[PDB]
Amino acid sequence: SQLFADLSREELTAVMRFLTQRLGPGLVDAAQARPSDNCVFSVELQLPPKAAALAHLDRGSPPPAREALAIVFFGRQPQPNVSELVVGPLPHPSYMRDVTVERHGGPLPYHRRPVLFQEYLDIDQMIFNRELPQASGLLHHCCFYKHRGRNLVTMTTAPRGLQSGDRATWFGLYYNISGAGFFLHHVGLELLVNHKALDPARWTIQKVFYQGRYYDSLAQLEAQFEAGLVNVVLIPDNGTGGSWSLKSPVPPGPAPPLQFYPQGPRFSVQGSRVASSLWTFSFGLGAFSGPRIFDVRFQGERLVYEISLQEALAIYGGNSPAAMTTRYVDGGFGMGKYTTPLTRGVDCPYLATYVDWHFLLESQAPKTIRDAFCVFEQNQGLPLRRHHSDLYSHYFGGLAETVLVVRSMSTLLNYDYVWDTVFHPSGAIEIRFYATGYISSAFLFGATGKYGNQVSEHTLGTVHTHSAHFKVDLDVAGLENWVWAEDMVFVPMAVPWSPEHQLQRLQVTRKLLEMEEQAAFLVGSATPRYLYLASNHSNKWGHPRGYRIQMLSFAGEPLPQNSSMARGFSWERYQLAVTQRKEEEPSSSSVFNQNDPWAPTVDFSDFINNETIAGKDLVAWVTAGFLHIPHAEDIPNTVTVGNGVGFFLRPYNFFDEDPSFYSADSIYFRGDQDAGACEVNPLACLPQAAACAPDLPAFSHGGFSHN
Amino acid sequence: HPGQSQLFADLSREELTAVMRFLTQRLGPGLVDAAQARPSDNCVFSVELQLPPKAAALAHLDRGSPPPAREALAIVFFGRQPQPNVSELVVGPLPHPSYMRDVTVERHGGPLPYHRRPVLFQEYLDIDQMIFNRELPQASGLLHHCCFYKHRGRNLVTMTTAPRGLQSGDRATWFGLYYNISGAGFFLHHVGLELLVNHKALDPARWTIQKVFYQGRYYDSLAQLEAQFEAGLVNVVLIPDNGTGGSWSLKSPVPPGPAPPLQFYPQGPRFSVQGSRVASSLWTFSFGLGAFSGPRIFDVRFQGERLVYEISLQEALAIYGGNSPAAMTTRYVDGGFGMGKYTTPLTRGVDCPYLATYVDWHFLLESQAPKTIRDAFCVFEQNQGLPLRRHHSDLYSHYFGGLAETVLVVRSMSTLLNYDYVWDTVFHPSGAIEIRFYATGYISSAFLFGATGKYGNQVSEHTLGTVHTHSAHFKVDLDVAGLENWVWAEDMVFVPMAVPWSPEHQLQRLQVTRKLLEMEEQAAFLVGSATPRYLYLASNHSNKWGHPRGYRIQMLSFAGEPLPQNSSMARGFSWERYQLAVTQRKEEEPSSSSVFNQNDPWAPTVDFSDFINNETIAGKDLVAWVTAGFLHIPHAEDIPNTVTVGNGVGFFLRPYNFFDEDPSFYSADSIYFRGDQDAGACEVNPLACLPQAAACAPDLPAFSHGGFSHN
Numbered sequence A: 001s002q003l004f005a006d007l008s009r010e011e012l013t014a015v016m017r018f019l020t021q022r023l024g025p026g027l028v029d030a031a032q033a034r035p036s037d038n039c040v041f042s043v044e045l046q047l048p049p050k051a052a053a054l055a056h057l058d059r060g061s062p063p064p065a066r067e068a069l070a071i072v073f074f075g076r077q078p079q080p081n082v083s084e085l086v087v088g089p090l091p092h093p094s095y096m097r098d099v100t101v102e103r104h105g106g107p108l109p110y111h112r113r114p115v116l117f118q119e120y121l122d123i124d125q126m127i128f129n130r131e132l133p134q135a136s137g138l139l140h141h142c143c144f145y146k147h148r149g150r151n152l153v154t155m156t157t158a159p160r161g162l163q164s165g166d167r168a169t170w171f172g173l174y175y176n177i178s179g180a181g182f183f184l185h186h187v188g189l190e191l192l193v194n195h196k197a198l199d200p201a202r203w204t205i206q207k208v209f210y211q212g213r214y215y216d217s218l219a220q221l222e223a224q225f226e227a228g229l230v231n232v233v234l235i236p237d238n239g240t241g242g243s244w245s246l247k248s249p250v251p252p253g254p255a256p257p258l259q260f261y262p263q264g265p266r267f268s269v270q271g272s273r274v275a276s277s278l279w280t281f282s283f284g285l286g287a288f289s290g291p292r293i294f295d296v297r298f299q300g301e302r303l304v305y306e307i308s309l310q311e312a313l314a315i316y317g318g319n320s321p322a323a324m325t326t327r328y329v330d331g332g333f334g335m336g337k338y339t340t341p342l343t344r345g346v347d348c349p350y351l352a353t354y355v356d357w358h359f360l361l362e363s364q365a366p367k368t369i370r371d372a373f374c375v376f377e378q379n380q381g382l383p384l385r386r387h388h389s390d391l392y393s394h395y396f397g398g399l400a401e402t403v404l405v406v407r408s409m410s411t412l413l414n415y416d417y418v419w420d421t422v423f424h425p426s427g428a429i430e431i432r433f434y435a436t437g438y439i440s441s442a443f444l445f446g447a448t449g450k451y452g453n454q455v456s457e458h459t460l461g462t463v464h465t466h467s468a469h470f471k472v473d474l475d476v477a478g479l480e481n482w483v484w485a486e487d488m489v490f491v492p493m494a495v496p497w498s499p500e501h502q503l504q505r506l507q508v509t510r511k512l513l514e515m516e517e518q519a520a521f522l523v524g525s526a527t528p529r530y531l532y533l534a535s536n537h538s539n540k541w542g543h544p545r546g547y548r549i550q551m552l553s554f555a556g557e558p559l560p561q562n563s564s565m566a567r568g569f570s571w572e573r574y575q576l577a578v579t580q581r582k583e584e585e586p587s588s589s590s591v592f593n594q595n596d597p598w599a600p601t602v603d604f605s606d607f608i609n610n611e612t613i614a615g616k617d618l619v620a621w622v623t624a625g626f627l628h629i630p631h632a633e634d635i636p637n638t639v640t641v642g643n644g645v646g647f648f649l650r651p652y653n654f655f656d657e658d659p660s661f662y663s664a665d666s667i668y669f670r671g672d673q674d675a676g677a678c679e680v681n682p683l684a685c686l687p688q689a690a691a692c693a694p695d696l697p698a699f700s701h702g703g704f705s706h707n
Numbered sequence B: 001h002p003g004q005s006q007l008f009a010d011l012s013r014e015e016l017t018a019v020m021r022f023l024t025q026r027l028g029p030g031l032v033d034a035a036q037a038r039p040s041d042n043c044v045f046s047v048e049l050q051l052p053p054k055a056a057a058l059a060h061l062d063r064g065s066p067p068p069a070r071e072a073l074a075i076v077f078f079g080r081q082p083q084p085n086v087s088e089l090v091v092g093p094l095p096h097p098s099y100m101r102d103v104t105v106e107r108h109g110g111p112l113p114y115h116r117r118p119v120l121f122q123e124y125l126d127i128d129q130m131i132f133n134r135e136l137p138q139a140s141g142l143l144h145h146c147c148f149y150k151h152r153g154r155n156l157v158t159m160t161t162a163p164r165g166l167q168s169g170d171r172a173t174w175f176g177l178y179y180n181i182s183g184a185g186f187f188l189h190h191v192g193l194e195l196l197v198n199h200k201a202l203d204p205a206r207w208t209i210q211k212v213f214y215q216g217r218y219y220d221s222l223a224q225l226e227a228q229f230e231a232g233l234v235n236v237v238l239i240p241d242n243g244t245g246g247s248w249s250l251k252s253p254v255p256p257g258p259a260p261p262l263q264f265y266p267q268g269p270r271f272s273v274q275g276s277r278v279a280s281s282l283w284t285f286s287f288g289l290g291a292f293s294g295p296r297i298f299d300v301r302f303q304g305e306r307l308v309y310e311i312s313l314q315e316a317l318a319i320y321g322g323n324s325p326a327a328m329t330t331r332y333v334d335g336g337f338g339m340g341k342y343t344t345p346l347t348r349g350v351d352c353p354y355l356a357t358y359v360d361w362h363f364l365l366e367s368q369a370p371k372t373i374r375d376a377f378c379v380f381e382q383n384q385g386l387p388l389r390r391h392h393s394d395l396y397s398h399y400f401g402g403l404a405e406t407v408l409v410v411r412s413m414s415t416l417l418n419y420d421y422v423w424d425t426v427f428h429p430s431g432a433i434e435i436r437f438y439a440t441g442y443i444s445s446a447f448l449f450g451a452t453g454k455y456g457n458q459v460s461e462h463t464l465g466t467v468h469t470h471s472a473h474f475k476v477d478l479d480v481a482g483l484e485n486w487v488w489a490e491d492m493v494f495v496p497m498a499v500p501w502s503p504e505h506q507l508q509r510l511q512v513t514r515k516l517l518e519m520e521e522q523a524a525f526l527v528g529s530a531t532p533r534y535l536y537l538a539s540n541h542s543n544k545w546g547h548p549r550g551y552r553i554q555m556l557s558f559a560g561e562p563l564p565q566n567s568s569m570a571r572g573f574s575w576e577r578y579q580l581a582v583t584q585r586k587e588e589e590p591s592s593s594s595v596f597n598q599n600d601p602w603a604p605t606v607d608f609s610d611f612i613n614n615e616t617i618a619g620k621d622l623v624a625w626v627t628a629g630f631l632h633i634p635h636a637e638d639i640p641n642t643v644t645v646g647n648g649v650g651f652f653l654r655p656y657n658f659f660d661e662d663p664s665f666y667s668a669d670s671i672y673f674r675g676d677q678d679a680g681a682c683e684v685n686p687l688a689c690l691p692q693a694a695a696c697a698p699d700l701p702a703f704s705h706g707g708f709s710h711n
């Protein structure tokens, strides 16, 4: 009976058929509609309100209605409109509601709609068949043209235009590499396209870029080339390793270290609920916001209503226009939408339990992305804790750290983003993310070096920053929370017993924060060392029951406030902020900012405002990221090592004593026992590890949906 | 003739007993075992490896030369004399020594003052005797009353303050008093009695007490405390003795339930250890353990090429504040007792994975018997549970390419009083190297007195968790593709600009910002200072694509605040005051600390700041000096023990245009397949084979533990 559980195939098949009948016709499958059509872009879970939800959970109350959110594209009509419509209740839908207005204020400018597959495709279409053949000449001598342009292929960018309501997208051309990253094979050609018009047939090419010069059309370029005024240089079709491959040329070795659970796995999962000895939670994946978990309960007490990914950012600098304009708000494509199957044994431990995911986006029928999350429990080869006494008393006590883990990955164009949430035995929670995949590359010539590093022959690794945003709804000891800030200080001070003769005196600096703007820290200026959300309540020794936040962020220096685009993602400007949780401030960003961020559909900076945070339902907003100047060793992919970024939620006089103390798996003995005695040291046991070892599930793979 | 010798190995027992014999002889008139030794006695305190000059070493390993004389270094206390000194002695050539030289003035420029020498075990006992026998006796009444004092001792217990004194030449320790708990930490059970003992004189008879402090009050002596108490005049607080859970135990009352995940190598280890030298398919190196300076690795080679000559713990710190005299005046310089010396056995299946491979370590400290420490190090390969890299292509072409990150690890743990420090080192398949250090163990705790809360939190009853900082210095002698290295700082910048193709408008132009640091002080960054996103050392040489070949230093501190430079003391750990420095590598710029700084940081044997001195760092043998740390404000969840999670702290050494492509491209365990293929095929995918093969896990070694004290 869970209510944070993403929608089933049956629930979607159910909502869709409800929409369809009750939107008359005019209705087209989003899959292949033109701008001028009506179509259903997204049907996905609508989150419930916190009040009714807890009421339901912690007090028997019947559960709040189970509702869905349909994003609908209203092409056909002279006031073309994107409407967010709520549909309910599930499982048998019977109502529908244009929230659009009351959500944002207006209705939605039809140009904030993100580009459909059909649209993307009609654009390629025009390029490959109207436009490109006007330089068939140049592109022969440049880069192997023939006969139409099956050898080449394009990539989206940025926001699309320079001011609000533009729909003007730069595209690069890359050799259509077979079985590797095309992303590294930028041909040197970039095309600004104007697909704003509802009639694609009215679409344009506002500008063109080749080898450092701008033009106003393709044929105008070719003209110039033919005039002999342009040193074309041939740019290799194929090659060897790294750039050109992902297949390792070396053969496989001895097999690598493998973890197994000698007697059963010690967690379980049905639905989207996970249950372990210590931990409990629901989980899932918003189409746009992506990963998230709910009702996280440790030994049965709830710590967080919700932790969810809000948004992700990538901001470039560059030689070319496409790159120097490009700033992706990847949520405006969808981490849900673009999530990929976990390849058993590589993305996750071989023996993880892998879960499927369902969606109805840009289609009329629901679909599954297999092996979309994995859950598992992992040994770190670290002790959680450990003491060894050879002084005064001879004994040892310690405990190895196992950990529980939930992972999804979202492959976005070139990047593969890894999303981690990690549940510790100490009661702590670690959220972490990693950038892998391939990188975004430009073509090389001259200016380079202010904008990055030749990472390959002809290829420029464009500089950029990654950044990411998390909503963190801690309900430390129940809802009313305060926010505290302890740091340290030294104080010059004569030494009591002999004062002349001074001593630097270490001291704590505790301090409460009433107002939103005190608890709101921008990149650049310093966090206090200890910062946590406390409760009204006290632990046993008389301290406010706390949970500390602790970031691991390397601070991609953020886009100037000064910029017109800025307010489309002003969360990048903050490391940490805290806020009065409101039902109608449910997100940092939104899908509709990607395409018009000059007029942001959501603007975070608003959430901060005079308001008090002495004893309210708080919510913290954590921002995490780093600067990525590419280098040769991002070839082919960029590795995870030292790309960890996230933060820690940590008990802080929340408990009365570290709960590991009550661990099944801790170990103790004193010199004067037989340390190798089964009922003295549980490790002295184990002997026989099953009949023979892991019984491994035969390896499968998700597939390539749209496969 | 590629020089295939060991020379970064610490000594064997033979090697020690040999040197010990050598010295026995050549000192003769009145030598004593140190474990028995007086103040006025003469003493071999330590004998350890003395490591080679680099010149010679490299010549040997690289241009197949003859390797340098293996030698050793002996610390000797010349107490039996008119002007007692400490002396540092070199003894070679091992294995059969035949010569001995004094380097005490070579290195330091005078003799060493004798009070700089560490406190011997013998001393500690003479001190404990003075206390438990000539003093607490005189306050029988108080103690009978508060602290259960049955005429004896197996009752209370002392523990030692940081620097002993407050001015150069002093040797006066504040000593806390606490309950002899059996089977758990005594650290928490302070009775609120601290005693300022003065144990300078070389006649312990002459040793005195200079102050008392009892539960928040100062008193001139223990007599003058009964004086009060008995005359009704002191308010006593009664401080229990038995208890349950947390503070009193370390033993889980709940029974063992199912088996944690377990890690095993389905066909053979994929690395080997051969004494000091570890070697795997890609990494190869020597390791060891300094007695005081602690863990260290050498001659690290990825795929045959060397990146670092040496990485090596330099010092550990802990600065306390508090309410008590003890705590408020503790700044521990843990090297002055020694992170080698106080290493402890890694407890198999807790401190490393069960199937790791564990390694004994030998030493000769405060004795004449060489002794061993069983399983002091562990080494192993670990499946991290990540991928080093994946990419899944759904668009244009269907394919997957990925690699789960398995990594290689070397560990040591140094239990120093309360602390259990863990020291890692982790060798990622990308050619990266992760240094990493945790604090667990127990908390140094004062007795709780009213005005707390700007000295910590309340933790058990009567139990204050005093606040402290943690530093740990490291030495990184990168030799990046050659000895001659430069230092680069790259970073980012926005510059606002007209939009080229529609200059009506304006964009923020993101830009890179390389800057070469010529001089030492340019590359010397203080704690809480602005700090180059990309910083690395590099060769004149350069990769295929033309960028200089480089290794990046990427830090992970939450670093405490430094003891103020105002203080007459920071002298003794100037390294604390730096995020990071870079420096010309010199042979007499070997350690940044010295065991002898602990007991005299007003006259520091080694002051790291002198190392920064206006020199070029352009195209030299450069060595980097990373400092890592964090603020600890204890709390209830540090009971019974402090916990790793989030207390890990260190740095990364990451390649940066050093290669021409990510080395892992060629890995064996790499995986790839196209959309048009079958991924369930052994011939497409190694992982298809892990049901049929990879069944049968090893029968496991029956637990052995390496024991306590002197084993």
Ligand SMILES: *[C@H]1O[C@H](CO)[C@@H](O[C@@H]2O[C@H](CO)[C@@H](O[C@@H]3O[C@H](CO[C@@H]4O[C@H](CO)[C@@H](O)[C@H](O)[C@@H]4O)[C@@H](O)[C@H](O[C@@H]4O[C@H](CO)[C@@H](O)[C@H](O)[C@@H]4O)[C@@H]3O)[C@H](O)[C@H]2NC(C)=O)[C@H](O)[C@H]1NC(C)=O
Binding pocket: A021, A022, A024, A074, A077, A079, A080, A081, A082, A083, A085, A098, A100, A101, A106, A107
């Ligand atoms: C953005 O764009 C959307 C999409 O256009 C606008 O919303 C739509 O437009 C009207 C509100 O301005 C609504 O017109 C409606 O037409 C419905 C007709 O049939 C319905 O028929 C089904 C059975 O098939 C019944 O169950 C329903 O009860 C309806 O009757 C009516 O509900 C209703 O009535 C009339 O419409 C007819 C033409 O159908 C007129 O000729 C007549 O004079 C009268 O107006 C209703 O007015 C439409 O419902 C609405 N759709 C939705 C889903 O909201 C948004 O209004 C735009 N947003 C903004 C802020 O402007």
Ligand SMILES: CN1CCN(c2ccc(Nc3cc(=O)n(-c4ccc(Cl)cc4)nc3-c3ncn[nH]3)cc2)CC1
Binding pocket: A117, A118, A120, A121, A124, A154, A155, A156, A333, A338, A412, A413, A706, B395, B396
């Ligand atoms: C029934 N299928 C679905 C429609 N098909 C299809 C395939 C590729 C595209 N084009 C794109 C899809 C796409 O998802 N993206 C894209 C992905 C992630 C991000 Cl962050 C941004 C864009 N891009 C395209 C596309 N970009 C340029 N050209 N095409 C459109 C339709 C093939 C047949």
Ligand SMILES: CN1CCN(c2ccc(Nc3cc(=O)n(-c4ccc(Cl)cc4)nc3-c3ncn[nH]3)cc2)CC1
Binding pocket: A391, B121, B122, B124, B125, B128, B158, B159, B160, B337, B342, B416, B417, B709, B710
């Ligand atoms: C075979 N041995 C004979 C000498 N023994 C012995 C035992 C304890 C001590 N006293 C101490 C030893 C000691 O190592 N430490 C200490 C430990 C870690 C750190 Cl960083 C600093 C000191 N302390 C004592 C001690 N402190 C206070 N009283 N005694 C002296 C001699 C018993 C076993």
Ligand SMILES: *[C@@H]1O[C@H](CO)[C@@H](O[C@@H]2O[C@H](CO)[C@@H](O)[C@H](O)[C@H]2NC(C)=O)[C@H](O)[C@H]1NC(C)=O
Binding pocket: B027, B078, B081, B085, B086, B087, B105, B110, B111
């Ligand atoms: C430190 O102590 C040692 C031994 O107490 C001193 O060594 C003696 O030095 C004298 C003259 O310098 C020699 O003639 C003796 O033969 C040495 N005796 C031994 C046993 O080595 C040493 O000189 C002292 N160092 C300093 C700098 O004063």
Ligand SMILES: *[C@@H]1O[C@H](CO)[C@@H](O[C@H]2O[C@H](CO)[C@@H](O)[C@H](O)[C@H]2NC(C)=O)[C@H](O)[C@H]1NC(C)=O
Binding pocket: A150, A152, A153, A176, A177, A178, A179, B396, B397, B398, B674, B675, B676
């Ligand atoms: C880019 O190259 C790939 C590689 O083949 C093309 O996709 C395929 O090509 C054939 C014709 O479409 C199919 O029969 C193959 O089965 C299919 N290959 C794979 C690996 O899935 C792709 O269409 C090419 N170009 C463009 C513009 O998409």
Ligand SMILES: *C1O[C@H](CO)[C@@H](O)[C@H](O)[C@H]1NC(C)=O
Binding pocket: B614
């Ligand atoms: C140290 O100082 C200068 C800069 O003033 C430096 O260039 C030089 O190498 C040193 N001094 C002298 C006098 O040469």
Ligand SMILES: *[C@@H]1O[C@H](CO)[C@@H](O)[C@H](O)[C@H]1NC(C)=O
Binding pocket: A610
């Ligand atoms: C914020 O609130 C207080 C009282 O609620 C009010 O008096 C004050 O003027 C406000 N200040 C600002 C800067 O908005």
Ligand SMILES: *[C@@H]1O[C@H](CO)[C@@H](O)[C@H](O)[C@H]1NC(C)=O
Binding pocket: A392, A393, A394, B153, B154, B155, B156, B157, B180, B181, B182
């Ligand atoms: C503390 O208890 C132990 C039991 O192992 C005992 O042997 C020891 O001597 C006791 N007291 C002291 C002061 O060492």
Ligand SMILES: *[C@@H]1O[C@H](CO)[C@@H](O)[C@H](O)[C@H]1NC(C)=O
Binding pocket: B242, B243
């Ligand atoms: C106190 O005595 C022992 C420890 O010495 C403890 O285990 C026992 O349970 C305690 N007392 C009582 C009354 O149970």
Ligand SMILES: *[C@@H]1O[C@H](CO)[C@@H](O)[C@H](O)[C@H]1NC(C)=O
Binding pocket: B484, B540, B541, B619
């Ligand atoms: C690099 O170092 C110095 C430059 O000052 C020179 O002696 C050496 O030959 C140089 N080598 C290369 C490959 O540039």
Ligand SMILES: [Ca+2]
Binding pocket: A516, A579, A580, A606, A607, A608, A609, A611
């Ligand atoms: Ca607000």
Ligand SMILES: [Ca+2]
Binding pocket: A473, A474, A475, A476, A479, A481, A581, A616, A617, A618, A619
């Ligand atoms: Ca909350």
Ligand SMILES: [Ca+2]
Binding pocket: B520, B583, B584, B610, B611, B612, B613, B615
């Ligand atoms: Ca120097």
Ligand SMILES: [Ca+2]
Binding pocket: B477, B478, B479, B480, B483, B485, B585, B620, B621, B622, B623
């Ligand atoms: Ca060097």
Ligand SMILES: [Cu+2]
Binding pocket: A435, A464, A466, A628, A638
């Ligand atoms: Cu990147």
Ligand SMILES: [Cu+2]
Binding pocket: B439, B468, B470, B632, B642
């Ligand atoms: Cu600590």
